[PDB]
Amino acid sequence: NQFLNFSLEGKVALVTGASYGIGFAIASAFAEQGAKVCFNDINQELVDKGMAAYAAKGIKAHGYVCDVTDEPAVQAMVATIAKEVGTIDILVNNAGIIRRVPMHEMDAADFRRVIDIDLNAPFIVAKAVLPAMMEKRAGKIINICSMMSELGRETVSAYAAAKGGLKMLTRNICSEYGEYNIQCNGIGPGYIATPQTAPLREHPFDSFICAKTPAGRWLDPEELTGPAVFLASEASNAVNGHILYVDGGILAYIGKQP
């Protein structure tokens, strides 16, 4: 029953920037579902750290040093993967940065670097994997979007612009490459409880998040892996050009009032 197939068995998956964090969680989940998982990071130490962490979880991953804004390096990475592992079946554009600076104070170079990593690079990696997917008439591209794909906030103009950009990039890849049985979709994460934010739950910030979220809690990073597996599997083949928000209800809710 292809329609209820949530297995990724035998599929080759590349998740960018997945030496740790949400990418690592999504890639580990793909491995658990039978996928052959690949990732990149920016230096050998991070990739080494990534590889060992995967290996400690019983996952033989394939790790590459690669800057996702450098198209020659990206193409060579995809070329290798295709030869050593298999042509990429599943791409997750996960690698990303954030800056927090008032827009009117932000250096032009810094705004452009946010756009370059968070919007231009997803296009580059997508472009690199699409020939082989078109050829096989099968492929999944998942763009890690954001609540900032929909809503703005002070200090994050460049990130919001990038993420709003990525959303339309998802819809365009759907429109342009859908006819090849390629599905390009988005995940928009809510507020994820990462180790770094632990002191914000030790709390006024915690109260604000909990009040804002119908579910009344932060999300565990692993709560994104179910959505990620779904979009990467045959079960979601008719889902295309869609941003799947995983936010515990935030974007649906006007908020808890006093």
Place this chain on the structure above:
Amino acid sequence: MNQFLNFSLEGKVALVTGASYGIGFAIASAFAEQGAKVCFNDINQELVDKGMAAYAAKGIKAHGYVCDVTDEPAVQAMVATIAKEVGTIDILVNNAGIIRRVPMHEMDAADFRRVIDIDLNAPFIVAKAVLPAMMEKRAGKIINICSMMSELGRETVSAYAAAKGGLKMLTRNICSEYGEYNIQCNGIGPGYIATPQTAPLRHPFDSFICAKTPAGRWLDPEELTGPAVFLASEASNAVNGHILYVDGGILAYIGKQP
């Protein structure tokens, strides 16, 4: 008088980028009719001069400047010269832009990046440059010319959709961040505009536009000037972070079926 129904722009200094012709020129000319002091830029002296002459024939004294909106230092010099010659900018319309048409998988990274830079990065650069005085005055208007491609994708226009998707979210973010200063940032999303450039398409393409549009016709450029004046006026002070679609109904309609 009644500030709530004040659609006049008397005294306000307006910059409309790339407004030597087309939609920009139509908007800038409407601003002038409403009492605004109007400035525009283009990329070379030949365009500026022709622009100036077209304003002059319509009885409009404009200020035209040679400026590359991707060159931050030049934008700053232009904004500063405008401040000396005319007055600090009260209304900005981010209108200058380009479109490329190329399958995404075949598009050079340079060309993708260039589309993003002119259509997304430059609006940020110019907004950055005009915000200081608006903040000091506790009054300001920034209108971004978005697109139906801020919502919907199409083959060949991946870079343009991404840029316009980004510009939608940049509009929301500037509202979020600068609204407290009584500055309003909003968008105009035009539908199919009947320009000299699109003259050939008016015919099977005409029937496509006519089928998709509840209004059942192309839009005249001047039909954007009502909405533009509205957003630039005191009448709209409570409208903030909002994309005003002027599309004769397209985005609301699933389309005419056989």
